[PDB]
Design a protein around this ligand. Structure first.
Ligand code: ADP
Ligand code: ALF
Ligand code: MG
Ligand code: ZN
Lengths: 656, 171
RNA sequence: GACUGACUGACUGA
RNA sequence: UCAGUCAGUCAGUC
């Protein structure tokens, strides 16, 4: 209530208060959410007595969903309209068919709406009478926003009432454009995707929009790599030794993969090693002698790849982290003892070099320098730090916690709901706790990608990007986090290519903000004509564009695990096998490593590879497996191919 | 009469900061400048003079952002910020366009100008004077450290192109 | 709290 | 056109 709408906010609603499907574009930090509120309030009051209208609000990321839901709840609490939400976190949700009808304003995460549409609980999209998309820029390709819009367009073009469509965005994006013409191509295609008709941008009140909204400045920091690194030398020499051992046993190793001029620290080397794994695994002989060859190649390749990952982790984190990674792998995990000795032979040297402070990673040193100067300048500041991956989040957290130099900082984390690769992220109450804490004692946030597209942590004076890059949409959303005035962004990187990419991205942004000024001069009906043309053409394209007993062997020791004709899917997702023979083909660990249920492991003492885990279903617990760990060989022919997920492989599925 | 001309040393120069050949001009480099790695280096965009002082006055001009000028002695730790550890007495221009003084790790708040340092441990007196068109009087206090004292400076290091230099006015 | 499955987008490389 | 990493989202069993 106490908010007094600013001029440009009133200006940005008229095209949508009139009832035309619209796209609303304004710089980051404008009052888009408030504008959506005004549009919804004015649309709600229009219906005559006896007829009521539902509003839907999508939002694709959970923290954003909670923030938007709270804003809507507080604003429309007074009037008495009833708001609600359906998401993935809700447990044993009461029927969605009923919850939609009971409540007027529904906030969803779009994949829910697609679920219900395909299932048939919501019959037809005609129920809703307003749709609001909080990232108009995502509606393309096969993103769930676009699948909702596909259903809508299919309903309109062929042959009831159909709902109004709004979208809010701060940057519509240029796709693959090279000149202004290609940008216009892409922007018109976007507008066509969601039944657009008007693009609304601030023009009259630009003078005011400049005073209230502050554009943060940008800066680039290029960091010298080390003159000489001891860690890299030692590990690379170990890798070369292992590579020579790999060379010996197989007649040819280079031919298996076309990739060439491999370097030790790159991702290219990772691709080489994986392709070599997947090529050696399919070598066949006319039949027990080659088992030793396969096992050996498995081991050499595996340890080589793990050293590679160590080098990369070392590049992006403190050296101690890489040493910890390697030590943990060797603790957990014949030839194995040979290479265990080969690592322990040098381990003390690595421990020595790790703790010598003069070899501290230069990037992290620059991060310390920048944080220290900035926080000394203004003692009250809040920083966001964007990192590519989840492991780097924990590494940087450790680094901040126990560095004497950066005492002021008091970190917090923020990642996404899902749990992947032995790290598990925050749950919804945890995210709410962190964000409300910022509203407090915390003074720096460590985020993955999920904290883009509007987290709205006011009073941010510093965004730091730790080798973070992408298409211009990402650049605009990331640079816009610093809502507070006086804010800065620092792109901090070691590779010159990234520094170049950010400059070309700034140029692309300028081109986009020109090609959207151009499109506002067309007549009011040429737009509608060409949009209908694009919609129809794309509908035609999309509509017509769609219309035994193989033995399973071990990926590492090539022993007859089971047969396809003896696997019965259970509840259509978990997979299981039956028979006393299979119960002899593995030996469950008496005290499994996680303990937290028992895992599976290969029967032989020679081979111990992760076949699966054990889970309990109703009365009887059953053994489940993962296809990543087997190799399929035909019952008659000798063919062999590798399937990463169950979905590619096709067998005579029969229910439990 | 008691005026001296302190000269910046390469001993404590910070990687980011840079110095001129005349050795009376200090600025912030556009790019990092490599230097030997030692615990002597500040690791913060600061600098320490070399004219050890155990009746000395010296004038630094602050024309051409944020600056701290002060006196600190060799005991001070490199990683700690100038003016906020015990041994160091400094005058700083905050980021909120106010002029503050840090003495004996105590905050004391108080329009900018070109400033001097006048110290005499003979009576344990430390004085600052902001002299532009008039002999304006700045914060003055009492402080005595056993070790001989050195002039010191801190120049905001994220913003390239701000330089601090030393003026040797004459009688 | 940890378990198994599918979906999508972005970035590389050949 | 095929590959390899990454990050978000949904479903089911405990
Ligand atoms: N009328 C107003 N007066 C003052 N502040 C406002 C007003 N409307 C919105 N804001 C502030 O602007 C902030 C950012 O708006 P938001 O919708 O998050 O921008 P974005 O377009 O990035 O989503 C909101 O947190 C709100 O507090
Ligand atoms: F909708 Al935004 F930053 F673009 F919250
Ligand atoms: Mg927003
Ligand atoms: Zn095996």
């Amino acid at each position: 209530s106490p908010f007094k709408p600013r001029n440009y906010q009133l200006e940005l609603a008229l095209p949508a208060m009139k009832g035309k499907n619209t796209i609303i574009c304004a710089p980051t930090g404008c009052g888009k959410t408030f504008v959506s509120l005004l549009i919804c309030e004015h649309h709600l009051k229009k219906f005559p007595q006896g007829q009521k209208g539902k509003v839907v609000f999508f939002a694709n990321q959970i923290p954003v969903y909670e923030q938007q839901k709270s804003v809507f709840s507080k604003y429309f609490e007074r009037h008495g309209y009833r708001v609600t939400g359906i998401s993935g976190a809700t447990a044993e949700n009461v029927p969605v068919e009923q919850i939609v009808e009971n409540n007027d304003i529904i906030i969803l995460t779009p994949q829910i709406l697609v679920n219900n549409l395909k299932k048939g609980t919501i019959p037809s999209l005609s129920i809703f009478t307003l749709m609001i998309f909080d990232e108009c820029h995502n509606t393309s390709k096969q993103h769930p926003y676009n699948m909702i819009m596909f259903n809508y367009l299919d309903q309109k073009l062929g042959g009831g009432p159909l709902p109004q469509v709004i979208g809010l965005t701060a940057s519509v994006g240029v796709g693959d454009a090279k000149n202004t013409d290609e940008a216009l191509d892409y922007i018109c295609k976007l507008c066509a995707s969601l039944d657009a008709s008007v693009i609304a941008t601030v023009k009259h009140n630009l003078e005011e929009l400049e005073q209230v909204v502050y554009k943060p400045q940008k800066f680039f920091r290029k960091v010298e790599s080390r003159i000489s690194d001891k860690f890299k030398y030692i590990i690379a020499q170990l890798m070369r030794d292992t590579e020579s051992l790999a060379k010996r046993i197989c007649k040819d190793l280079e031919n298996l993969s076309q990739i060439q001029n491999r370097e030790f620290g790159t991702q290219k080397y990772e691709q080489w090693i994986v392709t070599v794994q997947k090529a050696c695994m399919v070598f066949q002989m006319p039949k027990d002698e080659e088992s030793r060859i396969c096992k050996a190649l498995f081991l050499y390749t595996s340890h080589l790849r793990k050293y590679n990952d160590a080098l990369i982790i070392s590049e992006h984190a403190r050296m101690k982290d890489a040493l910890d990674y390697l030590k943990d792998f060797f603790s957990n995990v014949e030839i194995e003892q040979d290479l265990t000795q080969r690592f322990e032979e040098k381990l003390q040297e690595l421990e020595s070099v790790s703790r010598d402070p003069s070899n501290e990673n230069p990037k992290l040193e620059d991060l310390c320098f920048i944080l220290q100067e900035e926080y000394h300048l203004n003692p009250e500041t809040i920083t966001i730090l964007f990192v590519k991956t989840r492991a780097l989040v924990d590494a940087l957290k450790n680094w901040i916690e126990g560095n004497p130099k950066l005492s002021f900082l008091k970190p917090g984390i923020l990642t996404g709901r899902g749990k992947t690769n032995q790290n598990t992220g925050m749950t919804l109450p945890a995210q709410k706790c962190i964000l409300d804490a910022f509203k407090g004692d915390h003074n720096i946030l460590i985020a993955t990608s999920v904290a883009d597209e509007g987290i709205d942590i006011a009073q941010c004076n510093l965004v730091i990007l730790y080798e973070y890059v992408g298409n211009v949409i990402k650049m605009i959303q990331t640079r816009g986090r610093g809502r507070a005035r006086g804010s800065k962004c620092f792109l901090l990187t070691s590779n010159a290519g990234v520094i170049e990419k950010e400059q070309i991205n700034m140029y692309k942004e300028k081109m986009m903000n020109d090609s959207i000024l151009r499109l506002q001069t067309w007549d009011e009906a040429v737009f509608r004509e060409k949009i209908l043309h694009i919609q129809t053409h794309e509908k035609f394209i999309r509509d017509s564009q769609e219309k035994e007993n193989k033995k399973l062997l071990c990926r590492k020791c090539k022993a007859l695990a089971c047969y396809t004709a003896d696997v019965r899917v259970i509840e259509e997702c978990h997979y299981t096998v039956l028979g006393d023979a299979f119960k002899e083909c593995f030996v469950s660990r008496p005290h499994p490593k996680p303990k937290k249920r028992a895992k599976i492991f290969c029967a032989r003492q020679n081979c111990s590879h992760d076949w699966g885990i054990h889970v309990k279903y109703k009365t009887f617990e059953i053994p489940v497996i993962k296809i990543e760990s087997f190799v399929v060989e035909d019952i008659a022919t000798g063919v062999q191919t590798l399937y990463s997920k169950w979905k590619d492989f096709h067998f005579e599925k029969i229910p439990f | 009469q008691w005026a001296i001309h302190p000269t910046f040393n390469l001993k404590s120069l910070s990687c980011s900061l840079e110095v001129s050949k005349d050795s009376r001009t200090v600025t912030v480099s556009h790019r990092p400048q490599p230097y030997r790695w030692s615990c002597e280096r500040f690791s913060t965009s600061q600098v320490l003079c070399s004219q050890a002082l155990s009746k000395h006055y010296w004038e630094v001009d602050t024309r051409n952002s944020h600056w701290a000028v002060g006196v600190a002695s060799w005991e001070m730790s490199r990683d700690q910020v100038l003016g906020r550890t015990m041994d160091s007495c400094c005058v700083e221009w905050k980021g909120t366009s106010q002029l503050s003084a840090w003495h004996m790790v105590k905050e004391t708040v108080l329009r900018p100008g070109v400033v001097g340092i006048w110290l005499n441990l003979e009576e344990g007196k430390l004085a600052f004077y902001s002299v532009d068109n008039q002999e304006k009087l700045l914060y003055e206090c009492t402080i005595s450290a056993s070790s001989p004292l050195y002039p010191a400076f801190w120049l905001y290091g994220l913003h390239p192109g701000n330089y601090l230099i030393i003026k040797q006015v004459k009688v």
